């Protein structure tokens, strides 16, 4: 299993504009288009993102292209981030994937606010951090996904994703 396979389990694949768990306009593999309520604003972002007139619909091909960009940006964002970089550097390959997943879903900023859990992950206090991460909006709002990510940080193995 790798980062792409993991995220593709968590996000799914949709070739038509759709709404987030959050009500936001999205397409592909969890690619947020806009946080604006108009489908029209979303369509416009889409065409800007793909470089064509899409009419709200894209190919598999275009979906994966966006996904490659997104994962790349998530990693680079972690690397540029003063709060994120040190934790990332400290982790093993599998747990690194768990942090990338959180960044992809919630953005740099969002994850950088989990101060206390970050501190625990750096210290390698796996069970404590798993308990702390669960005390969040994130977990309450998307509990099955949060729990998969949390198991990953807890164990350092891919079991939460074997099932799936």
From Swiss-Prot:
Substrate binds at residues 32, 104, 117, 132. Keywords: Antimicrobial, Bacteriolytic enzyme, Cytolysis, Glycosidase, Host cell lysis by virus, Host cytoplasm, Hydrolase, Viral release from host cell. Its EC number is 3.2.1.17. One of its GO terms (cellular component) is host cell cytoplasm. It catalyses: Hydrolysis of (1->4)-beta-linkages between N-acetylmuramic acid and N-acetyl-D-glucosamine residues in a peptidoglycan and between N-acetyl-D-glucosamine residues in chitodextrins. Changing residue 20 to E/Q: Loss of 99% of enzymatic activity. It is an enzyme of class 3 (hydrolase). It comes from the Viruses. It is found in: Host cytoplasm. Optimum pH is 7.3. Induction: Expressed late in the viral replication. Changing residue 117 to I: 500-fold decrease in enzymatic activity. The active site is at 11 (proton donor/acceptor), 20 (proton donor/acceptor). This is Endolysin. The lineage of its organism: Viruses, Duplodnaviria, Heunggongvirae, Uroviricota, Caudoviricetes. The gene is E.
């Amino acid at each position: 299993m790798n980062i792409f396979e993991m995220l593709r389990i968590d996000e799914g694949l949709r070739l038509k504009i759709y709404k987030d768990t959050e009500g936001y306009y999205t397409i592909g593999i969890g690619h947020l288009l806009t946080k604006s309520p108009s489908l029209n604003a979303a369509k416009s972002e889409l065409d800007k993102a793909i470089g064509r007139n899409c009419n709200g619909v894209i190919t598999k091909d275009e979906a994966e292209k966006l996904f490659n960009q997104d994962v790349d940006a998530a990693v680079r964002g972690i690397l540029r981030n003063a709060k994120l970089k040190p934790v990332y550097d400290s982790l093993d390959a599998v747990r690194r994937c768990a942090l990338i997943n959180m960044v992809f879903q919630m953005g740099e900023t969002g994850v950088a606010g989990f101060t206390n859990s970050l501190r625990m992950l750096q210290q390698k206090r796996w069970d404590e951090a798993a308990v702390n991460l669960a005390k969040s909006r994130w977990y309450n709002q998307t509990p099955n996904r949060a729990k998969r990510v949390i198991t990953t940080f807890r164990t350092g193995h891919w079991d939460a994703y074997k099932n799936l």
